[PDB]
Amino acid sequence: APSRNGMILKPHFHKDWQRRVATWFNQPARKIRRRKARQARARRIAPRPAAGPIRPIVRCPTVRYHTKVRAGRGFSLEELRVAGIHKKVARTIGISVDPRRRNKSTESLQANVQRLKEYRSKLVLFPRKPSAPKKGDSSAEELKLATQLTGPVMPIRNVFKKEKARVITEEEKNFKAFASLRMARANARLFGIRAKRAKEAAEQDVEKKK
Amino acid sequence: LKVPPAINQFTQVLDRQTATQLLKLAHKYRPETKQEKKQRLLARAEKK
Amino acid sequence: ERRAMELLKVSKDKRALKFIKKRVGTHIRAKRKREELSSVLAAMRKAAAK
Amino acid sequence: GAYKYIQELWRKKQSDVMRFLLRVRCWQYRQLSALHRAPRPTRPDKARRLGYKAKQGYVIYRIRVRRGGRKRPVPKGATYGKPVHHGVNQLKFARSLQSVAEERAGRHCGALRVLNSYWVGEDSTYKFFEVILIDPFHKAIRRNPDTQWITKPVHKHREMRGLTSAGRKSRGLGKGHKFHHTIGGSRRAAWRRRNTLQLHRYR
RNA sequence: CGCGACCUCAGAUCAGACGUGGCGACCCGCUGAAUUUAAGCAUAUUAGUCAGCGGAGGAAAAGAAACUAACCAGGAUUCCCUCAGUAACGGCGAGUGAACAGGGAAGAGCCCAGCGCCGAAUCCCCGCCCCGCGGCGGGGCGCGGGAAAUGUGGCGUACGGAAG
RNA sequence: GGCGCGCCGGGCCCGGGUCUUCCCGGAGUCGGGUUGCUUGGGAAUGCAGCCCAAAGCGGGUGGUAAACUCCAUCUAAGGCU
């Protein structure tokens, strides 16, 4: 029975909720497991990074997040082949592999051919046996000095190029900001109506001649 | 039942003087026996 | 198929389009099929002359 | 070479020839028992797609299934309750008259394991299916690395738990927007996520 | 009339291996209410919940897209935060009710049927010794039986594959 | 038990870049009409029966029925993890 002024409101407790209640009393020594069996992981994989195979330069979609950059799933099959690393050799040296990814612009394709040389250079690669190395395998001084990495490998931070303070020319100031947004809206919507009547008016001149 | 014409051509068969003659030319061009493959595979390791 | 190749012989190619639709599928599923039947029909309207 | 033409000719049932063959053969399954073994596979093409090979181990049973629908079981026809639920004569079964084959092969032959099934004839009261199964202890199958996925204790009675390709279809799964009521594992566990209270500690 | 091959089908206390039944707290497949809310009550609500039947495991189920998008594009599955008590339903009444983007935990990816090249190159069982094993596996020797061209094994499957 | 490292004993004859010529895939299923259950999915989100039942520049999807159209994006009717 509502008294007086006071917001109307709909609860969903009409089912038998109590029989399905979830609690997190676990919450503290469920963390302290992950962190343990986390701590197991990389003692198993000694000088390989615990940061694992490296994630590509990838955007966020739609008009909201399309200003941003983030880590992805895997490197496309025209970024691996151009650089000089094969798809089944790339798995065997910390470089990500995904069979689906696309190349639609060359502004996010040149950014992922350079990404793989940075890496290929700064890697340290051990010999098959300790007592007999070969050709591409690195020397026994780096390998002395070489050691594990912590946190994402070459992590992608948020970037923007700066600009100076400029004296404005006499045709920037003579450019409308609102009336050029309204004459691009007008001609996008009405172009379907435009073209059929430039056709039907030019149709009648053809008929009355012949 | 009205057996249709494509499955009906299997009753059409080769006669007696041709069927006992056609298995005498194929008698000279048989595959070798399973016991022949123990003196042919073995016959390479005698000469080499 | 035989029955739709008997409205195509006698040129009622609408009723035939409107007959194939109910059987096989949509208006464009009954288009190429009506274009296929016409072309085998047109085949045996050559191989009789020759 | 020959398996390119065997596929394309079974896809011509409304021809003259296949109309005759799917008729003689179907007369000749109303005559034999409602579950019975079959010496070799009838459509050797279509079988070999769904996994079969010819080797001392595999096997086929050929089961028949009564055709039609479901009628709701109550004494005389008296479902006691509200009016929505008076329904008995136009309701249907959620799984299929395929999978009911895969299962009855399954139950009878309890040593063997189900793998897949396929169509072979129909009448007006009967639908007929062939049904691949595997002896999971024949040394042939125990010792081909590829096959041994079936020998393992989890794949017991696949047919009974919606796992075979005829099985899977009722549980309402695929990828995308058309299947939202499964995200989670399976239908049940979509429902569960949506109906807990998630009571943390501080609140 | 006999003799022999196949095909489809009997019988055995024939030689060797498998299934049944139990527990059921969490998982999978079915089938399936009414009390009760609407201040009456038939659609709605309870609720795909109670009871019924069936199958499992140390977790199950899902799983490398006939996927989301409408972007300067994300890229298997599960899980937490958020998106939201929203967009959508609803005697438009009571009432119910998502996803995608964003950020985390975890992170791993692959095999055939089919087109066709390599003298079935492939597998199962048996008699005999050497070793040897309380997960019957290792080598040699069988004019030893059988499966198989109604198709076995090797290269190989959309990220394309092959020969020269 | 578990990693590392010799001595005998068993296998295995194998790898990438340019040029020419071949060659490519799941059917009573996809798809619809209708009937009943289901869903937040509205001229029908998913499932099933009975009827009709394909295509190969072809087939699904693109949240309001359809005709006439260019684009954008996945390869369905077999399998493991």
* Chain A residues within 8 A of D197 when measuring between CB atoms: 17, 20-22
| 3-state SS, residue A18 | helix
Half-sphere exposure of B44 (CA within 13 A, CB side): 4
Q: Is A21 on the interface with D (CB under 8 A)?
A: yes
Q: Is B9 on the interface with D (CB under 8 A)?
A: no
> Which tokens belong to A33?
């497991």
Alpha carbon distance D131, D142 (integer Å): 21
Across the B/D interface, how many CB contacts are shorter than 8 Å? Answer: 11
Distance from CA of A22 to the nearest CA of D (A): 5
What single DSSP character describes residue A167? P
Would residue D76 be called left, alpha or beta, if left means φ above 0 and alpha means ψ between -120 and 50 degrees? left
Q: Is B4 on the interface with D (CB under 8 A)?
A: yes
> Which tokens belong to A176?
């409308």
Alpha carbon distance A29, A23 (integer Å): 14
The closest of D116, D120, D141 to D52, measured between CA atoms, is D116
Residue A54 burial (10 A CB sphere; 0-12, 13-18, 19+): buried
The helix (run of H) or strand (run of E) holding residue A31 is: helix A28-44
**Burial track A162-201 (b if 16+ CB lie within 10 A, e otherwise):** eeeeeeeeeeeeeeeeeeeeeeeeeeeeeeeeeeeeeeee
CB atoms within 10 A of CB C4: 22
Q: Parallel, antiparallel, or unpaired: how do β-strands A21-23 and A57-59 relate?
A: unpaired
Residue D141 burial (10 A CB sphere; 0-12, 13-18, 19+): buried
Nearest to D198 among A15, A22, A25 (CB): A22
> Which tokens belong to D152?
């393992």
**End-to-end C-alpha distance for chain B, whole angstroms:** 66
What single DSSP character describes residue A156? -
SS (H, E, C) A82-115: HHCCCHHHHCCCCECECCCCCCCCCCCCCCCCHH
Alpha carbon distance A129, D197 (integer Å): 56
Would residue D172 be called left, alpha or beta, if left means φ above 0 and alpha means ψ between -120 and 50 degrees? left
Across the strands, what pairs with D65?
D127
